Amino acid sequence: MIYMPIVVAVDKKSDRAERVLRFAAEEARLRGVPVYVVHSLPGGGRTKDEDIIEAKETLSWAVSIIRKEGAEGEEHLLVRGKEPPDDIVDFADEVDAIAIVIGIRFGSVARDVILKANKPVICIK
Amino acid sequence: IYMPIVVAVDKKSDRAERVLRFAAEEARLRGVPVYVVHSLPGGGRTKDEDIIEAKETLSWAVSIIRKEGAEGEEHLLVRGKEPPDDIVDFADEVDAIAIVIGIRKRSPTGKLIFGSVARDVILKANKPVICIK
Ligand SMILES: Nc1ncnc2c1ncn2[C@H]1C[C@H](O)[C@@H](COP(=O)(O)O)O1
C-alpha cells in the first residue's frame, strides 16, 4: 500500500523523453512500484490554460508509454508557484521517491535537480 | 550476455558505501553483476602507494557488494587516460546498463563539494548515470 515510486520528469514528447520513460518503467517494474510522471508549471498569472493543455497531452502521452511498458503510471501536473527543478525536487521528497529520472542533453533544470535532489538522480541521454 | 552495473569508487568512505549499496541493489534487482572500477593515470603520475590503496578500496568495495547479495568484480583501470574518460569508455566497452557514481567529493577543507570527475562522467557518458549523494 505504501510504496516508494519512481518519479520521472517530462518536459515534452520526444525520443529522449521516451528513453527516460522506458528506463523509469523498467525500474518501477523491477521494484514493484508505480511511476509518477511529473510536469511543472509556474501557475499564478504566468500560466495560461493553453499551457495546461499541452502539459496534459505530454503527461497523457508519457503515462501511456509507462503502461505499454508494463508498469503502473500516474500523471502529476504541478502548478504551485515554483520553477521546475524545485518542483521536481520538492515533489520527489513529498512522495518519498526511490529515485528521480530525468533526461539530459547539463541543461539548467537538470543541473539543479542533480545538485538539489535529496534522492538518487538518474540521468538518461 | 549480461549488461553489468558499473560503479566508480575513489576512496573508502561511508559515502562510497552508499554508492555501492545502491549499485548492489540495482544489480540484485536485474540479476546482473557489479563491475567496481577505479581509474589511475599510470606512468609517472602513479606511485606504488596509489596502486596498493586502489586495490584495497576495490577489495573493500567488492566485499560491500557481496554483503548486499550481489556479485562484484574488481576492475582497476590503468590506461594513461583521465578518470572521466576511463569510466565512460569502460562502461561502453562492457555495455553497462548504467554507471553508479558518487557526485560529492571532499575538498581540502573537509567539505563535500560537487565532484568534477563525477560531473564530467554525467556529461560524457553514453550510458545512464545514477547520481548518489
Ligand atoms: N517544466 C518542466 N516540468 C517537468 N520536467 C521538466 C520541465 N523542464 C524540463 N524538464 C525535464 C525534461 C528532462 O527530462 C529534464 C532536462 O531538462 P533541461 O531543461 O534540459 O535541463 O528536465
Side-chain angles (χ1 to χ4, degrees), chain B residues 90-128:
Chain B
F90 178 82
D92 286 341
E93 284 163 20
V94 317
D95 194 28
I97 193 73
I99 311 166
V100 186
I101 193 169
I103 59 185
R104 290 147 108 210
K105 191 222 191 171
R106 311 197 73 79
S107 76
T109 61
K111 310 298 162 58
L112 287 176
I113 57 176
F114 191 38
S116 61
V117 170
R119 172 205 166 98
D120 291 359
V121 169
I122 295 164
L123 289 170
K124 295 162 170 261
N126 297 302
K127 304 298 182 143

PDB file of all heavy atoms in Angstrom, chain B residues 90-128:
ATOM      1  N   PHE B  90      35.021   2.566 -20.354  1.00  0.00           N
ATOM      2  CA  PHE B  90      34.865   1.238 -19.768  1.00  0.00           C
ATOM      3  C   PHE B  90      33.385   0.837 -19.785  1.00  0.00           C
ATOM      4  O   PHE B  90      33.033  -0.315 -20.084  1.00  0.00           O
ATOM      5  CB  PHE B  90      35.400   1.215 -18.341  1.00  0.00           C
ATOM      6  CG  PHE B  90      35.243  -0.106 -17.650  1.00  0.00           C
ATOM      7  CD1 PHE B  90      36.146  -1.118 -17.863  1.00  0.00           C
ATOM      8  CD2 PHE B  90      34.178  -0.325 -16.782  1.00  0.00           C
ATOM      9  CE1 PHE B  90      35.998  -2.350 -17.228  1.00  0.00           C
ATOM     10  CE2 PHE B  90      34.024  -1.528 -16.137  1.00  0.00           C
ATOM     11  CZ  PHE B  90      34.932  -2.541 -16.347  1.00  0.00           C
ATOM     12  N   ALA B  91      32.511   1.786 -19.452  1.00  0.00           N
ATOM     13  CA  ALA B  91      31.113   1.447 -19.357  1.00  0.00           C
ATOM     14  C   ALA B  91      30.606   1.071 -20.755  1.00  0.00           C
ATOM     15  O   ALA B  91      29.816   0.121 -20.878  1.00  0.00           O
ATOM     16  CB  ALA B  91      30.304   2.597 -18.739  1.00  0.00           C
ATOM     17  N   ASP B  92      31.077   1.780 -21.794  1.00  0.00           N
ATOM     18  CA  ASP B  92      30.746   1.430 -23.193  1.00  0.00           C
ATOM     19  C   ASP B  92      31.338   0.069 -23.604  1.00  0.00           C
ATOM     20  O   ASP B  92      30.655  -0.755 -24.200  1.00  0.00           O
ATOM     21  CB  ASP B  92      31.201   2.525 -24.177  1.00  0.00           C
ATOM     22  CG  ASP B  92      30.317   3.779 -24.130  1.00  0.00           C
ATOM     23  OD1 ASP B  92      29.167   3.731 -23.630  1.00  0.00           O
ATOM     24  OD2 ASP B  92      30.764   4.821 -24.639  1.00  0.00           O
ATOM     25  N   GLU B  93      32.613  -0.147 -23.300  1.00  0.00           N
ATOM     26  CA  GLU B  93      33.280  -1.434 -23.502  1.00  0.00           C
ATOM     27  C   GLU B  93      32.549  -2.627 -22.896  1.00  0.00           C
ATOM     28  O   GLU B  93      32.530  -3.723 -23.482  1.00  0.00           O
ATOM     29  CB  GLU B  93      34.684  -1.392 -22.876  1.00  0.00           C
ATOM     30  CG  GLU B  93      35.682  -0.618 -23.695  1.00  0.00           C
ATOM     31  CD  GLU B  93      36.927  -0.229 -22.914  1.00  0.00           C
ATOM     32  OE1 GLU B  93      37.229  -0.846 -21.855  1.00  0.00           O
ATOM     33  OE2 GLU B  93      37.592   0.721 -23.378  1.00  0.00           O
ATOM     34  N   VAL B  94      31.997  -2.450 -21.696  1.00  0.00           N
ATOM     35  CA  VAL B  94      31.341  -3.583 -21.036  1.00  0.00           C
ATOM     36  C   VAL B  94      29.840  -3.580 -21.286  1.00  0.00           C
ATOM     37  O   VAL B  94      29.144  -4.493 -20.878  1.00  0.00           O
ATOM     38  CB  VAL B  94      31.689  -3.692 -19.532  1.00  0.00           C
ATOM     39  CG1 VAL B  94      33.196  -3.459 -19.300  1.00  0.00           C
ATOM     40  CG2 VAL B  94      30.847  -2.746 -18.656  1.00  0.00           C
ATOM     41  N   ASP B  95      29.360  -2.564 -21.992  1.00  0.00           N
ATOM     42  CA  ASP B  95      27.945  -2.427 -22.334  1.00  0.00           C
ATOM     43  C   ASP B  95      27.113  -2.437 -21.050  1.00  0.00           C
ATOM     44  O   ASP B  95      26.181  -3.228 -20.889  1.00  0.00           O
ATOM     45  CB  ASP B  95      27.493  -3.511 -23.349  1.00  0.00           C
ATOM     46  CG  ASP B  95      26.116  -3.204 -23.982  1.00  0.00           C
ATOM     47  OD1 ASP B  95      25.732  -2.030 -24.097  1.00  0.00           O
ATOM     48  OD2 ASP B  95      25.417  -4.142 -24.372  1.00  0.00           O
ATOM     49  N   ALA B  96      27.455  -1.512 -20.159  1.00  0.00           N
ATOM     50  CA  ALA B  96      26.830  -1.393 -18.856  1.00  0.00           C
ATOM     51  C   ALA B  96      25.362  -1.003 -19.008  1.00  0.00           C
ATOM     52  O   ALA B  96      25.005  -0.286 -19.923  1.00  0.00           O
ATOM     53  CB  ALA B  96      27.558  -0.348 -18.028  1.00  0.00           C
ATOM     54  N   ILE B  97      24.506  -1.467 -18.116  1.00  0.00           N
ATOM     55  CA  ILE B  97      23.117  -0.970 -18.103  1.00  0.00           C
ATOM     56  C   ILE B  97      23.084   0.482 -17.580  1.00  0.00           C
ATOM     57  O   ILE B  97      22.228   1.340 -17.979  1.00  0.00           O
ATOM     58  CB  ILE B  97      22.220  -1.972 -17.332  1.00  0.00           C
ATOM     59  CG1 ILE B  97      20.734  -1.677 -17.568  1.00  0.00           C
ATOM     60  CG2 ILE B  97      22.588  -2.021 -15.876  1.00  0.00           C
ATOM     61  CD1 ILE B  97      20.242  -2.075 -18.982  1.00  0.00           C
ATOM     62  N   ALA B  98      24.055   0.782 -16.723  1.00  0.00           N
ATOM     63  CA  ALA B  98      24.151   2.060 -16.074  1.00  0.00           C
ATOM     64  C   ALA B  98      25.469   2.124 -15.290  1.00  0.00           C
ATOM     65  O   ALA B  98      26.028   1.077 -14.903  1.00  0.00           O
ATOM     66  CB  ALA B  98      22.969   2.244 -15.096  1.00  0.00           C
ATOM     67  N   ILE B  99      25.927   3.360 -15.087  1.00  0.00           N
ATOM     68  CA  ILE B  99      27.023   3.735 -14.222  1.00  0.00           C
ATOM     69  C   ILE B  99      26.467   4.369 -12.939  1.00  0.00           C
ATOM     70  O   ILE B  99      25.677   5.321 -13.005  1.00  0.00           O
ATOM     71  CB  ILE B  99      27.932   4.762 -14.905  1.00  0.00           C
ATOM     72  CG1 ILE B  99      28.314   4.323 -16.350  1.00  0.00           C
ATOM     73  CG2 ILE B  99      29.186   5.054 -14.042  1.00  0.00           C
ATOM     74  CD1 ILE B  99      28.917   5.435 -17.180  1.00  0.00           C
ATOM     75  N   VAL B 100      26.898   3.857 -11.781  1.00  0.00           N
ATOM     76  CA  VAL B 100      26.545   4.429 -10.475  1.00  0.00           C
ATOM     77  C   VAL B 100      27.784   5.147  -9.950  1.00  0.00           C
ATOM     78  O   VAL B 100      28.885   4.597 -10.012  1.00  0.00           O
ATOM     79  CB  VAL B 100      26.065   3.355  -9.478  1.00  0.00           C
ATOM     80  CG1 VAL B 100      25.566   3.996  -8.155  1.00  0.00           C
ATOM     81  CG2 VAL B 100      24.937   2.513 -10.095  1.00  0.00           C
ATOM     82  N   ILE B 101      27.613   6.418  -9.521  1.00  0.00           N
ATOM     83  CA  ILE B 101      28.740   7.234  -9.093  1.00  0.00           C
ATOM     84  C   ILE B 101      28.363   8.208  -7.965  1.00  0.00           C
ATOM     85  O   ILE B 101      27.218   8.693  -7.895  1.00  0.00           O
ATOM     86  CB  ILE B 101      29.316   7.973 -10.319  1.00  0.00           C
ATOM     87  CG1 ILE B 101      30.680   8.584 -10.008  1.00  0.00           C
ATOM     88  CG2 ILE B 101      28.342   9.061 -10.820  1.00  0.00           C
ATOM     89  CD1 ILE B 101      31.388   9.078 -11.291  1.00  0.00           C
ATOM     90  N   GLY B 102      29.308   8.470  -7.071  1.00  0.00           N
ATOM     91  CA  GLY B 102      29.127   9.436  -6.005  1.00  0.00           C
ATOM     92  C   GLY B 102      29.403  10.828  -6.524  1.00  0.00           C
ATOM     93  O   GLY B 102      30.496  11.090  -6.988  1.00  0.00           O
ATOM     94  N   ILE B 103      28.443  11.728  -6.457  1.00  0.00           N
ATOM     95  CA  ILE B 103      28.658  13.090  -7.080  1.00  0.00           C
ATOM     96  C   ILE B 103      29.308  14.143  -6.178  1.00  0.00           C
ATOM     97  O   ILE B 103      29.560  15.287  -6.618  1.00  0.00           O
ATOM     98  CB  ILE B 103      27.377  13.703  -7.618  1.00  0.00           C
ATOM     99  CG1 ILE B 103      26.334  13.868  -6.523  1.00  0.00           C
ATOM    100  CG2 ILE B 103      26.856  12.874  -8.775  1.00  0.00           C
ATOM    101  CD1 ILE B 103      24.996  14.364  -7.042  1.00  0.00           C
ATOM    102  N   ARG B 104      29.561  13.769  -4.930  1.00  0.00           N
ATOM    103  CA  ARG B 104      30.209  14.660  -3.984  1.00  0.00           C
ATOM    104  C   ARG B 104      31.566  14.126  -3.650  1.00  0.00           C
ATOM    105  O   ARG B 104      31.773  12.922  -3.614  1.00  0.00           O
ATOM    106  CB  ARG B 104      29.399  14.788  -2.715  1.00  0.00           C
ATOM    107  CG  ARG B 104      28.114  15.559  -2.907  1.00  0.00           C
ATOM    108  CD  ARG B 104      27.069  15.020  -1.986  1.00  0.00           C
ATOM    109  NE  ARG B 104      26.792  15.938  -0.896  1.00  0.00           N
ATOM    110  CZ  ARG B 104      26.402  15.573   0.319  1.00  0.00           C
ATOM    111  NH1 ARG B 104      26.264  14.284   0.648  1.00  0.00           N
ATOM    112  NH2 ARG B 104      26.182  16.513   1.222  1.00  0.00           N
ATOM    113  N   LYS B 105      32.477  15.044  -3.391  1.00  0.00           N
ATOM    114  CA  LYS B 105      33.888  14.733  -3.147  1.00  0.00           C
ATOM    115  C   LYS B 105      34.378  15.682  -2.073  1.00  0.00           C
ATOM    116  O   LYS B 105      33.945  16.828  -2.049  1.00  0.00           O
ATOM    117  CB  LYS B 105      34.672  14.991  -4.421  1.00  0.00           C
ATOM    118  CG  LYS B 105      36.095  14.453  -4.388  1.00  0.00           C
ATOM    119  CD  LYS B 105      37.059  15.431  -4.999  1.00  0.00           C
ATOM    120  CE  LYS B 105      38.432  14.804  -5.222  1.00  0.00           C
ATOM    121  NZ  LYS B 105      39.295  15.723  -6.023  1.00  0.00           N
ATOM    122  N   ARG B 106      35.296  15.244  -1.220  1.00  0.00           N
ATOM    123  CA  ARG B 106      35.792  16.105  -0.145  1.00  0.00           C
ATOM    124  C   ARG B 106      36.800  17.079  -0.678  1.00  0.00           C
ATOM    125  O   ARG B 106      37.754  16.677  -1.333  1.00  0.00           O
ATOM    126  CB  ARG B 106      36.488  15.336   0.978  1.00  0.00           C
ATOM    127  CG  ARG B 106      35.758  14.149   1.518  1.00  0.00           C
ATOM    128  CD  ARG B 106      36.314  13.703   2.875  1.00  0.00           C
ATOM    129  NE  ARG B 106      35.912  14.644   3.921  1.00  0.00           N
ATOM    130  CZ  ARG B 106      34.705  14.680   4.504  1.00  0.00           C
ATOM    131  NH1 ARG B 106      33.751  13.815   4.180  1.00  0.00           N
ATOM    132  NH2 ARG B 106      34.451  15.589   5.437  1.00  0.00           N
ATOM    133  N   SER B 107      36.616  18.352  -0.336  1.00  0.00           N
ATOM    134  CA  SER B 107      37.568  19.361  -0.675  1.00  0.00           C
ATOM    135  C   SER B 107      38.708  19.274   0.351  1.00  0.00           C
ATOM    136  O   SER B 107      38.593  18.562   1.359  1.00  0.00           O
ATOM    137  CB  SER B 107      36.928  20.733  -0.583  1.00  0.00           C
ATOM    138  OG  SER B 107      36.810  21.109   0.784  1.00  0.00           O
ATOM    139  N   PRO B 108      39.804  20.006   0.107  1.00  0.00           N
ATOM    140  CA  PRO B 108      40.906  20.047   1.088  1.00  0.00           C
ATOM    141  C   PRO B 108      40.549  20.609   2.474  1.00  0.00           C
ATOM    142  O   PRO B 108      41.356  20.505   3.383  1.00  0.00           O
ATOM    143  CB  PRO B 108      41.959  20.938   0.412  1.00  0.00           C
ATOM    144  CG  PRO B 108      41.702  20.830  -1.024  1.00  0.00           C
ATOM    145  CD  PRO B 108      40.211  20.545  -1.200  1.00  0.00           C
ATOM    146  N   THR B 109      39.378  21.220   2.629  1.00  0.00           N
ATOM    147  CA  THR B 109      38.936  21.699   3.938  1.00  0.00           C
ATOM    148  C   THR B 109      38.028  20.713   4.646  1.00  0.00           C
ATOM    149  O   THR B 109      37.550  21.011   5.736  1.00  0.00           O
ATOM    150  CB  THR B 109      38.178  23.036   3.831  1.00  0.00           C
ATOM    151  OG1 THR B 109      37.013  22.850   3.027  1.00  0.00           O
ATOM    152  CG2 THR B 109      39.062  24.112   3.226  1.00  0.00           C
ATOM    153  N   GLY B 110      37.794  19.551   4.042  1.00  0.00           N
ATOM    154  CA  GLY B 110      36.870  18.554   4.593  1.00  0.00           C
ATOM    155  C   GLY B 110      35.405  18.706   4.194  1.00  0.00           C
ATOM    156  O   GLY B 110      34.571  17.920   4.589  1.00  0.00           O
ATOM    157  N   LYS B 111      35.085  19.701   3.384  1.00  0.00           N
ATOM    158  CA  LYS B 111      33.707  19.936   2.986  1.00  0.00           C
ATOM    159  C   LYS B 111      33.398  19.243   1.675  1.00  0.00           C
ATOM    160  O   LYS B 111      34.224  19.205   0.740  1.00  0.00           O
ATOM    161  CB  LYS B 111      33.432  21.429   2.889  1.00  0.00           C
ATOM    162  CG  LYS B 111      33.878  22.193   4.149  1.00  0.00           C
ATOM    163  CD  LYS B 111      33.157  21.765   5.432  1.00  0.00           C
ATOM    164  CE  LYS B 111      33.921  22.213   6.692  1.00  0.00           C
ATOM    165  NZ  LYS B 111      34.110  23.673   6.726  1.00  0.00           N
ATOM    166  N   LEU B 112      32.214  18.664   1.608  1.00  0.00           N
ATOM    167  CA  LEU B 112      31.800  17.961   0.409  1.00  0.00           C
ATOM    168  C   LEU B 112      31.356  18.995  -0.643  1.00  0.00           C
ATOM    169  O   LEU B 112      30.591  19.909  -0.351  1.00  0.00           O
ATOM    170  CB  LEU B 112      30.668  16.980   0.731  1.00  0.00           C
ATOM    171  CG  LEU B 112      31.054  15.717   1.517  1.00  0.00           C
ATOM    172  CD1 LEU B 112      29.794  14.937   1.822  1.00  0.00           C
ATOM    173  CD2 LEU B 112      32.072  14.826   0.773  1.00  0.00           C
ATOM    174  N   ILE B 113      31.863  18.842  -1.857  1.00  0.00           N
ATOM    175  CA  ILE B 113      31.523  19.695  -2.970  1.00  0.00           C
ATOM    176  C   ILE B 113      31.164  18.806  -4.174  1.00  0.00           C
ATOM    177  O   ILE B 113      31.456  17.593  -4.183  1.00  0.00           O
ATOM    178  CB  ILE B 113      32.702  20.635  -3.298  1.00  0.00           C
ATOM    179  CG1 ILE B 113      33.980  19.841  -3.602  1.00  0.00           C
ATOM    180  CG2 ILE B 113      32.952  21.662  -2.111  1.00  0.00           C
ATOM    181  CD1 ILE B 113      35.207  20.736  -4.055  1.00  0.00           C
ATOM    182  N   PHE B 114      30.513  19.400  -5.167  1.00  0.00           N
ATOM    183  CA  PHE B 114      30.184  18.718  -6.421  1.00  0.00           C
ATOM    184  C   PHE B 114      31.482  18.278  -7.125  1.00  0.00           C
ATOM    185  O   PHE B 114      32.322  19.119  -7.463  1.00  0.00           O
ATOM    186  CB  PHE B 114      29.370  19.675  -7.306  1.00  0.00           C
ATOM    187  CG  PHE B 114      28.737  19.025  -8.515  1.00  0.00           C
ATOM    188  CD1 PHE B 114      28.206  17.740  -8.453  1.00  0.00           C
ATOM    189  CD2 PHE B 114      28.667  19.708  -9.723  1.00  0.00           C
ATOM    190  CE1 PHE B 114      27.631  17.136  -9.598  1.00  0.00           C
ATOM    191  CE2 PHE B 114      28.096  19.127 -10.840  1.00  0.00           C
ATOM    192  CZ  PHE B 114      27.563  17.838 -10.777  1.00  0.00           C
ATOM    193  N   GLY B 115      31.690  16.966  -7.253  1.00  0.00           N
ATOM    194  CA  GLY B 115      32.915  16.438  -7.883  1.00  0.00           C
ATOM    195  C   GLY B 115      33.002  16.733  -9.378  1.00  0.00           C
ATOM    196  O   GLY B 115      32.017  16.554 -10.117  1.00  0.00           O
ATOM    197  N   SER B 116      34.172  17.133  -9.853  1.00  0.00           N
ATOM    198  CA  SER B 116      34.317  17.430 -11.283  1.00  0.00           C
ATOM    199  C   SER B 116      34.459  16.192 -12.163  1.00  0.00           C
ATOM    200  O   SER B 116      33.938  16.193 -13.280  1.00  0.00           O
ATOM    201  CB  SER B 116      35.426  18.431 -11.559  1.00  0.00           C
ATOM    202  OG  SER B 116      36.658  17.928 -11.128  1.00  0.00           O
ATOM    203  N   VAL B 117      35.124  15.137 -11.667  1.00  0.00           N
ATOM    204  CA  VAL B 117      35.103  13.835 -12.353  1.00  0.00           C
ATOM    205  C   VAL B 117      33.664  13.341 -12.505  1.00  0.00           C
ATOM    206  O   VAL B 117      33.248  12.976 -13.600  1.00  0.00           O
ATOM    207  CB  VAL B 117      35.951  12.755 -11.642  1.00  0.00           C
ATOM    208  CG1 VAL B 117      35.708  11.359 -12.230  1.00  0.00           C
ATOM    209  CG2 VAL B 117      37.436  13.115 -11.756  1.00  0.00           C
ATOM    210  N   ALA B 118      32.902  13.360 -11.415  1.00  0.00           N
ATOM    211  CA  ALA B 118      31.534  12.885 -11.445  1.00  0.00           C
ATOM    212  C   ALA B 118      30.746  13.720 -12.444  1.00  0.00           C
ATOM    213  O   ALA B 118      30.079  13.194 -13.359  1.00  0.00           O
ATOM    214  CB  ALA B 118      30.923  12.968 -10.056  1.00  0.00           C
ATOM    215  N   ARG B 119      30.854  15.030 -12.314  1.00  0.00           N
ATOM    216  CA  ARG B 119      30.240  15.912 -13.285  1.00  0.00           C
ATOM    217  C   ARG B 119      30.599  15.520 -14.745  1.00  0.00           C
ATOM    218  O   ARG B 119      29.733  15.428 -15.585  1.00  0.00           O
ATOM    219  CB  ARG B 119      30.653  17.352 -12.996  1.00  0.00           C
ATOM    220  CG  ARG B 119      30.233  18.377 -14.040  1.00  0.00           C
ATOM    221  CD  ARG B 119      31.166  19.548 -13.984  1.00  0.00           C
ATOM    222  NE  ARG B 119      31.053  20.435 -15.138  1.00  0.00           N
ATOM    223  CZ  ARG B 119      30.349  21.574 -15.181  1.00  0.00           C
ATOM    224  NH1 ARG B 119      29.640  21.993 -14.124  1.00  0.00           N
ATOM    225  NH2 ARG B 119      30.340  22.299 -16.307  1.00  0.00           N
ATOM    226  N   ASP B 120      31.870  15.304 -15.037  1.00  0.00           N
ATOM    227  CA  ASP B 120      32.261  15.003 -16.406  1.00  0.00           C
ATOM    228  C   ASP B 120      31.697  13.667 -16.883  1.00  0.00           C
ATOM    229  O   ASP B 120      31.379  13.530 -18.089  1.00  0.00           O
ATOM    230  CB  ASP B 120      33.788  15.060 -16.568  1.00  0.00           C
ATOM    231  CG  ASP B 120      34.328  16.477 -16.446  1.00  0.00           C
ATOM    232  OD1 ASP B 120      33.512  17.399 -16.261  1.00  0.00           O
ATOM    233  OD2 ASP B 120      35.565  16.678 -16.525  1.00  0.00           O
ATOM    234  N   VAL B 121      31.542  12.713 -15.946  1.00  0.00           N
ATOM    235  CA  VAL B 121      31.006  11.390 -16.262  1.00  0.00           C
ATOM    236  C   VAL B 121      29.542  11.475 -16.667  1.00  0.00           C
ATOM    237  O   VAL B 121      29.131  10.870 -17.672  1.00  0.00           O
ATOM    238  CB  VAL B 121      31.174  10.391 -15.072  1.00  0.00           C
ATOM    239  CG1 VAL B 121      30.383   9.115 -15.312  1.00  0.00           C
ATOM    240  CG2 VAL B 121      32.652  10.093 -14.830  1.00  0.00           C
ATOM    241  N   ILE B 122      28.779  12.245 -15.891  1.00  0.00           N
ATOM    242  CA  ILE B 122      27.378  12.560 -16.184  1.00  0.00           C
ATOM    243  C   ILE B 122      27.238  13.222 -17.558  1.00  0.00           C
ATOM    244  O   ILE B 122      26.365  12.886 -18.336  1.00  0.00           O
ATOM    245  CB  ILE B 122      26.796  13.565 -15.139  1.00  0.00           C
ATOM    246  CG1 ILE B 122      26.733  12.938 -13.745  1.00  0.00           C
ATOM    247  CG2 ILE B 122      25.398  13.972 -15.545  1.00  0.00           C
ATOM    248  CD1 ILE B 122      26.534  13.950 -12.609  1.00  0.00           C
ATOM    249  N   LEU B 123      28.117  14.158 -17.869  1.00  0.00           N
ATOM    250  CA  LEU B 123      28.043  14.844 -19.162  1.00  0.00           C
ATOM    251  C   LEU B 123      28.513  14.003 -20.354  1.00  0.00           C
ATOM    252  O   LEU B 123      27.887  14.050 -21.415  1.00  0.00           O
ATOM    253  CB  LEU B 123      28.838  16.136 -19.125  1.00  0.00           C
ATOM    254  CG  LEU B 123      28.233  17.269 -18.274  1.00  0.00           C
ATOM    255  CD1 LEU B 123      29.283  18.419 -18.127  1.00  0.00           C
ATOM    256  CD2 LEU B 123      26.918  17.783 -18.887  1.00  0.00           C
ATOM    257  N   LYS B 124      29.610  13.259 -20.192  1.00  0.00           N
ATOM    258  CA  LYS B 124      30.169  12.477 -21.300  1.00  0.00           C
ATOM    259  C   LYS B 124      29.549  11.086 -21.500  1.00  0.00           C
ATOM    260  O   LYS B 124      29.630  10.532 -22.585  1.00  0.00           O
ATOM    261  CB  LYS B 124      31.687  12.313 -21.139  1.00  0.00           C
ATOM    262  CG  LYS B 124      32.508  13.596 -21.226  1.00  0.00           C
ATOM    263  CD  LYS B 124      33.940  13.371 -20.613  1.00  0.00           C
ATOM    264  CE  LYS B 124      34.912  14.518 -20.866  1.00  0.00           C
ATOM    265  NZ  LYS B 124      35.870  14.274 -22.018  1.00  0.00           N
ATOM    266  N   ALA B 125      28.957  10.486 -20.483  1.00  0.00           N
ATOM    267  CA  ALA B 125      28.583   9.062 -20.608  1.00  0.00           C
ATOM    268  C   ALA B 125      27.553   8.840 -21.714  1.00  0.00           C
ATOM    269  O   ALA B 125      26.700   9.676 -21.956  1.00  0.00           O
ATOM    270  CB  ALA B 125      28.060   8.480 -19.250  1.00  0.00           C
ATOM    271  N   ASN B 126      27.647   7.698 -22.376  1.00  0.00           N
ATOM    272  CA  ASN B 126      26.605   7.257 -23.287  1.00  0.00           C
ATOM    273  C   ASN B 126      25.563   6.453 -22.513  1.00  0.00           C
ATOM    274  O   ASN B 126      24.390   6.423 -22.874  1.00  0.00           O
ATOM    275  CB  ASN B 126      27.203   6.472 -24.433  1.00  0.00           C
ATOM    276  CG  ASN B 126      28.131   7.322 -25.275  1.00  0.00           C
ATOM    277  OD1 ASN B 126      27.725   8.345 -25.820  1.00  0.00           O
ATOM    278  ND2 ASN B 126      29.395   6.931 -25.343  1.00  0.00           N
ATOM    279  N   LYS B 127      25.962   5.844 -21.408  1.00  0.00           N
ATOM    280  CA  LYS B 127      25.016   5.072 -20.603  1.00  0.00           C
ATOM    281  C   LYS B 127      24.266   5.915 -19.580  1.00  0.00           C
ATOM    282  O   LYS B 127      24.663   7.022 -19.246  1.00  0.00           O
ATOM    283  CB  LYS B 127      25.750   3.952 -19.878  1.00  0.00           C
ATOM    284  CG  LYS B 127      26.512   3.036 -20.801  1.00  0.00           C
ATOM    285  CD  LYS B 127      25.593   2.322 -21.756  1.00  0.00           C
ATOM    286  CE  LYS B 127      26.359   1.367 -22.636  1.00  0.00           C
ATOM    287  NZ  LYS B 127      25.556   0.156 -22.865  1.00  0.00           N
ATOM    288  N   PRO B 128      23.164   5.379 -19.057  1.00  0.00           N
ATOM    289  CA  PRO B 128      22.545   6.081 -17.926  1.00  0.00           C
ATOM    290  C   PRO B 128      23.498   6.208 -16.743  1.00  0.00           C
ATOM    291  O   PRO B 128      24.254   5.263 -16.449  1.00  0.00           O
ATOM    292  CB  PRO B 128      21.361   5.204 -17.564  1.00  0.00           C
ATOM    293  CG  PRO B 128      21.012   4.447 -18.884  1.00  0.00           C
ATOM    294  CD  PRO B 128      22.340   4.286 -19.599  1.00  0.00           C
TER     295      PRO B 128
END
